[PDB]
Ligand binder design. Structure first.
Ligand SMILES: [Cl-]
Ligand SMILES: [Cl-]
Length: 263
């Protein structure tokens, strides 16, 4: 109880100065126990949905319904804001693996839309979430419209508990084959967008795989698998929405949650 109470306390106090709502899930794989703050509240996913999207691609690969080497051609009209890799390959296309890599490690938005188009879109991804036992998450829109984060709007949302359970299932559990779960871990570990969030707050000896999300109405998120030194892995989800402090402070709040998980 003391660890649960202490973390819930530190989250309430951070949330008070942020102006918004702070949701935190910490799943300790040694025990199966989950602690945190606002565990069952709804938060906009923003780019955190891309972990589920890459997971569904790999689950389809496991079933011979998709091939990581399949090439996708696309047009300039498919490009949306924040597409650093896909904007360079309009002429030559990208493989499904390259699109997953760009969606996870750079948060490339067109790459994620092309993955959504490969498997039935937002409704197809939501059906995959239901297959993991997740009755909470729902994706409704594609990039960039899903980042609106309107107050109280349930579209494009998850909960800290639901996403932590899904991230555990896809990386450490058995939702994916051993080859596919290792590939997803590799992409998460190679993420380039998380240096000011959980990675900045956890002890430097820990290994981190993560996916960020950022959106309107003061929304900043980070979800991660954390490997401590001589302690079982943790799954940590952090969702901040409705923050009214400046963006740099939202990043610091997430880093400070990372520090609280470790301490
Ligand atoms: Cl199946
Ligand atoms: Cl659920």
């Amino acid at each position: 109880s003391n660890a649960a109470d202490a973390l819930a306390d530190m989250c309430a106090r951070l949330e008070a100065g942020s102006g918004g709502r702070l949701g935190v899930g910490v799943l300790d794989t040694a025990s199966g126990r989950m602690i945190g703050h606002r565990l069952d509240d709804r938060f906009p996913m923003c780019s955190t949905f891309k972990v589920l999207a890459a997971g569904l691609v790999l689950a389809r690969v496991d079933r011979k319904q998709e091939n990581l080497d399949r090439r996708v051609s696309y047009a300039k009209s498919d490009l949306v804001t924040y597409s650093p890799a896909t904007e360079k390959h309009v002429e030559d296309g990208m493989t499904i693996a390259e699109l997953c890599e760009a969606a996870i490690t750079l948060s490339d938005n067109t790459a994620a839309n092309l993955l959504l188009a490969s498997f039935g879109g937002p409704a197809g991804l939501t059906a995959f979430a239901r297959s993991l036992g997740d009755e909470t998450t729902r994706l409704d829109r594609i990039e960039t419209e899903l980042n609106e984060a309107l107050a109280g709007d349930p579209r494009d949302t998850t909960s800290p508990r639901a996403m932590a359970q899904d991230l555990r299932a896809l990386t450490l559990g058995d939702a994916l084959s051993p080859a596919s779960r290792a590939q997803l871990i590799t992409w998460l570990k190679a993420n380039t967008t998380g240096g000011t969030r959980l990675r900045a707050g956890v002890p430097p000896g820990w290994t981190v795989g993560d996916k960020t999300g950022t959106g309107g109405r003061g929304t900043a998120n980070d979800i991660a698998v954390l490997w401590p030194l001589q302690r079982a892995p943790l799954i940590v989800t952090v969702y901040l929405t409705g923050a009214t402090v400046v963006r740099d402070q939202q990043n610091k709040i997430i880093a400070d949650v990372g520090a609280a998980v470790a301490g």
